[PDB]
Amino acid sequence: GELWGIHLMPPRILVECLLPNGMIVTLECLREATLITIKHELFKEARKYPLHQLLQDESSYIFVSVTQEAEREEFFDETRRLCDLRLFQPFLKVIEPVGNREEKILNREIGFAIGMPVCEFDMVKDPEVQDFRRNILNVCKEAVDLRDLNSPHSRAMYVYPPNVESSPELPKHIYNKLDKGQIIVVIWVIVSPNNDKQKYTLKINHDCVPEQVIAEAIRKLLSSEQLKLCVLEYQGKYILKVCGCDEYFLEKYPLSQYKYIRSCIMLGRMPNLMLMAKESLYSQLPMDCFTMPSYSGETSTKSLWVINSALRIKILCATYVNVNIRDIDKIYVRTGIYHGGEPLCDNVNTQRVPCSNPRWNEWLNYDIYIPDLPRAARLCLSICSVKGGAKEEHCPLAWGNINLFDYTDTLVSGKMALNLWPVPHGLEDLLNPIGVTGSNPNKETPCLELEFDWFSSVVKFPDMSVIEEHANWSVSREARLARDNELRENDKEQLKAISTRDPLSEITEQEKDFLWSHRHYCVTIPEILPKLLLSVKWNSRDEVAQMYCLVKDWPPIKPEQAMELLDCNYPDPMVRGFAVRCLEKYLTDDKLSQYLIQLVQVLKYEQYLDNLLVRFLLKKALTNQRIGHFFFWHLKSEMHNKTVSQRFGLLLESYCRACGMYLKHLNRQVEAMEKLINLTDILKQEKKDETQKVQMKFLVEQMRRPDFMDALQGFLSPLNPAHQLGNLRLEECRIMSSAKRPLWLNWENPDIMSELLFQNNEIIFKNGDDLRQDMLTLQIIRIMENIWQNQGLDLRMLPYGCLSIGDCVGLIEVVRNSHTIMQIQCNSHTLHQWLKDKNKGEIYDAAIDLFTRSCAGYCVATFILGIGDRHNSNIMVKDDGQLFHIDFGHFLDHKKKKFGYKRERVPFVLTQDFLIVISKGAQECTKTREFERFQEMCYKAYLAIRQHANLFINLFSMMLGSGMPELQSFDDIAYIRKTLALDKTEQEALEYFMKQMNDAHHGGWTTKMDWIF
Amino acid sequence: MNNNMSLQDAEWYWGDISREEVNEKLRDTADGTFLVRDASTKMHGDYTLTLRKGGNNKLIKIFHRDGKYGFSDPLTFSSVVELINHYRNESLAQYNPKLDVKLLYPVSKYQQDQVVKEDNIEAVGKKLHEYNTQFQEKSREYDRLYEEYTRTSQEIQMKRTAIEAFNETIKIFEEQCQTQERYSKEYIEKFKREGNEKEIQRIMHNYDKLKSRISEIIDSRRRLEEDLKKQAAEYREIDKRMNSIKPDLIQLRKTRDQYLMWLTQKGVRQKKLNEWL
Ligand SMILES: Nc1cc(O)cc(-c2nc(N3CCOCC3)c3sccc3n2)c1
């Protein structure tokens, strides 16, 4: 609502005006009215009331009121209409403005972007929060200096970064689509203000730099030798632009390396590249201004390694617990000292006590020496219940995690209170080590009081120089030893074999002792690092100290392998720093965008607000606006969640402070989505029993309002910020049939050359259902497509855009010309007849091939991921033959629970309808040449993903703290290990795959025993 | 009796179950709990002993060569049953001083048989249906309570913010009283002289309107405080109901799994399991 308890207010409405002479003036006002129009009306009527002798002019004062977010907001932009103020109640107080105007405008623009007032960060006592706010600004100022160093090209490269692949090398199947290694490309030019578009058709080498493409354009009857004059002087004149897009080829990459050009080759489409002046775009850039905000006896210190004492913690009491005293028998506090997901010692419980009296007052003793506590050691705890022939069930009531060391490396001491968190849906584990650290900010909440020991005023974890000294001392006692004994051939082969195991294939105790014995030789095979780290005794400072020295000079590893080390099983800062430094060196902006969803989710596992990963991602977000766009939206989408509100809020502030002009573009996107959220709330609450006809009329009348028309037009698509959303085709916007009332929206593409790409942009807005599962599944599909393309498998998938923008709020890209199977069928030959009728003629084999290739990838992809069962409404088919899937819903076979079946099912079973299409209308569709070729495409594709299994396990391991019910534990991720058959042999994995298909198809999936007979 | 037993009949032997299936059965169990599965068909070794130590699962590969079994060279045990039973009555300190513990509590594959004493297949299949029906019923009841819990959490937070907004509004209108009291005292004390009560009438009328509006807002904040107290109580009550269902859900699921386990043994058809589930 825009006024508390109200969606919107009638134009005529009263406002209580509190003047500085002490007087209150109820004023007739308009909703449309800007602030000075109201201030005109106010001082017009203020003559009547007492002490009019005591007011300055209207220009001397400013209005102030309370907002929906309980903020005392001063309204400086007085062209803001009243409904867009978001007042709590209709009142305004005029005052004389004090303090910095520039800063308060920016702070409220940042506040609107984030979804919380920036002033709430001022109130946070926690020194880590205030230190983060100050110290993170170094990355901000560093980021703006990087994009102004080689100005104004770096300025343009920030806003319109080159959308490219990682590698310049083409796969052979891409190169062979070109004519003699050349692409036919059309360059468009505007005439003048007349706009009578013209085209210069070119044919050039695929590896041509945009400079060379511009050079060929000016050729397409004058002197020949004079051409060297214009191509040197007027090369910087022009720059290339994609038609129908806000996307530019500003960098000297090969033409084929750009994503649009690579996309145009595969589809068989003419690439259309508008020629445009460089001065036109360069002067258009904002030249933005980042400014530093306004918030920019002796201690008896002691080392951790000096404390001669075992660990103990005192559990005092809990304030309350929500338990029926009749049903539950006892309660207690479960407790553990964790390093990531691994207990450093045995978990210790308090004594059992009555439900009514949660009071313990006992020291729990742990068998771990305080000096052996690793840097990332955490207390994990919960208040658990007991219910219960001498059999009993233990359940968690609430949970909480505490870092044993704070952000300044100080060991915790004395009494502290921990407000606990509610248990996530589906978690039956008594402790929640994967969950975030820190107290619950809601104080109306179970609060466990506890007391750590006190040894001195400040107990610090030792410095790296002190650790190296102990490492050298420890290795001397145990039996240059890197090269003193020689690595045998038998030992060398086993080290290579251990390194090929996947992230979740646990090393044995023999393999642990073997890896640690050969820790000095492991440097030769640096991809073994994650196995070596698992072999360390993390509850032994001797072994940990030696690992630090090995990690210090460890050869850097590939980004995909470094991403393993960012999950919840590797919490040590030296390991995580190493991982981040691999990404800094070797992670391209392309692959950062590919894996950004996971890298943002990794921030939830970080012990502290300030770490090396968040500085890396913030910097990359502030130096690449494509990365910055999705960085913003992934963080913003979870600002409702109080486990990460503070962290993501602080991070989003830092971003919005330094991102420059894009904050204005983001604010329009936020404003647009908020208005769609509000309308769909009203449809679901108020218009529940109303018909879809009436809901449409309600929608159209609300959307036709000028306030909505300004907000919902002329902004950038959150699915792709290159796609500009112009005017609404409001007549063609519709409500979908689904329970949550999704809006099929339709916008004009306002680009000057829109017709050459698309004239309109269709997006499905969705409020009720969680779209993170589909967002993730669609990301994985795109990655699966990329693996297959580079390996020669042309299996074209359709990873259409999907972005979660809030709490179960998301957007979905509409694929044009796509139809469900249920529409086509409405007889087993109907599908083949439709596809033939849509591509009737000589271009029939190209459509059937594209269908068969599309079926293959989705058959394999869906089997691997365990998506929800495919029916005719879930499967779609395009005009050109491309089949694809929608509404993945759940994955990793999440509905294995609420059922007894351990079996791995086949979501996408090929009925006879699909088999007849692949066989080109044949009767015995399971026996033909085309079907046997289809099988081999499924098998090749299956083995290609198995070979890249580590990547997919690593990506899912980064998501475990997301809050998705499908990814709570490593048990859930282990579904893909079973479908990829990673414990089995490659040949056995193929046999497994065949057997699963054959069981699902009821014999119809012809086995390897094909009968020529 | 013991060492002459076959490996197939051994309670602690589980065959080709996955490493994750082992983790399920060992999750949050006491030290000394153990079982044996087949080793991964990609790796060296035949079987894998998994056991609890310091709240962690320790995996120990059992190798084979020329009639002898063991963790490492030399292989000294005539069978797997001899190897296990040896470390049931003796510490693994012998093998490795690091892990001083015995194999105390075998995770039996005949555990379900102790619970489900009924020998008949169809009878056990009918109980599976009864338990699965009860489990799905309580699961849906919990799912409804959790939807309410999350909805109530959202509405409580909106009310909490509205109270803060009311308190800011009450502060601003209270500041206006001080602003009035400040500038009124200088003028009213002058305008009491010159006999102009029309001036005091019009000023005090406005001051009483300010005091009238404050009273209304404070009462509106007071009413919202009671609504919050009402809903905060409901929130705790919804949490109580969920905490009573949780232990019953764990028991029903574990009992269903045992009745499923009993029917996986004796090779019951997959279509018969789906009809009961
Ligand atoms: N829940 C859900 C999740 C999800 O990823 C997609 C859908 C979804 N998507 C559709 N399209 C339009 C064509 O382009 C691709 C997406 C359609 S068309 C008719 C129903 C429907 N439902 C629904």
CSV table of C-alpha atoms and ligand atoms in Angstrom, one decimal, chain A residues 736-738 742 744 764 766 769-771 774-775 778 798 800-802 812-816 818-820 823 873 876 884-889, ligand 1:
chain,number,residue,atom,x,y,z
A,736,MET,CA,-2.6,-16.7,-16.9
A,737,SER,CA,-4.8,-19.7,-15.8
A,738,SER,CA,-2.5,-20.7,-12.9
A,742,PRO,CA,0.7,-14.8,-13.3
A,744,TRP,CA,1.6,-12.4,-19.3
A,764,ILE,CA,5.7,-13.6,-17.5
A,766,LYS,CA,4.8,-14.4,-11.2
A,769,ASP,CA,5.5,-19.6,-6.6
A,770,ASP,CA,9.2,-19.9,-5.8
A,771,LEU,CA,11.2,-19.5,-9.0
A,774,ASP,CA,13.7,-23.0,-12.2
A,775,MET,CA,16.3,-20.2,-12.2
A,778,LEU,CA,17.7,-23.2,-16.4
A,798,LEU,CA,16.5,-23.6,-24.7
A,800,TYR,CA,15.1,-19.2,-21.5
A,801,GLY,CA,15.6,-16.3,-19.1
A,802,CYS,CA,14.4,-16.7,-15.5
A,812,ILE,CA,10.2,-15.6,-17.0
A,813,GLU,CA,11.2,-15.0,-20.7
A,814,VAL,CA,8.5,-15.8,-23.2
A,815,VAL,CA,9.8,-17.8,-26.2
A,816,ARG,CA,8.1,-16.8,-29.4
A,818,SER,CA,6.2,-22.0,-28.9
A,819,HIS,CA,3.3,-24.4,-28.2
A,820,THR,CA,2.6,-27.1,-25.6
A,823,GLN,CA,-2.5,-27.9,-27.8
A,873,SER,CA,1.6,-29.1,-20.7
A,876,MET,CA,6.7,-27.3,-25.6
A,884,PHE,CA,12.0,-27.8,-24.9
A,885,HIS,CA,10.7,-28.0,-21.3
A,886,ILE,CA,9.1,-25.6,-18.9
A,887,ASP,CA,8.0,-25.5,-15.2
A,888,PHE,CA,10.8,-27.7,-13.7
A,889,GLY,CA,9.3,-27.0,-10.2
C,1,LIG,N1,5.7,-22.2,-13.1
C,1,LIG,C1,6.4,-22.0,-14.3
C,1,LIG,C2,7.8,-22.0,-14.4
C,1,LIG,C3,8.4,-21.8,-15.6
C,1,LIG,O1,9.8,-21.7,-15.8
C,1,LIG,C4,7.7,-21.6,-16.8
C,1,LIG,C5,6.2,-21.6,-16.8
C,1,LIG,C6,5.5,-21.4,-18.0
C,1,LIG,N2,6.2,-20.8,-19.1
C,1,LIG,C7,5.7,-20.6,-20.3
C,1,LIG,N3,6.5,-20.1,-21.3
C,1,LIG,C8,6.1,-19.2,-22.4
C,1,LIG,C9,6.9,-19.6,-23.6
C,1,LIG,O2,8.3,-19.3,-23.3
C,1,LIG,C10,8.7,-20.1,-22.3
C,1,LIG,C11,8.0,-19.9,-21.0
C,1,LIG,C12,4.3,-21.0,-20.4
C,1,LIG,S1,3.2,-20.9,-21.7
C,1,LIG,C13,1.9,-21.6,-20.9
C,1,LIG,C14,2.2,-21.9,-19.6
C,1,LIG,C15,3.6,-21.5,-19.3
C,1,LIG,N4,4.2,-21.7,-18.1
C,1,LIG,C16,5.6,-21.8,-15.5
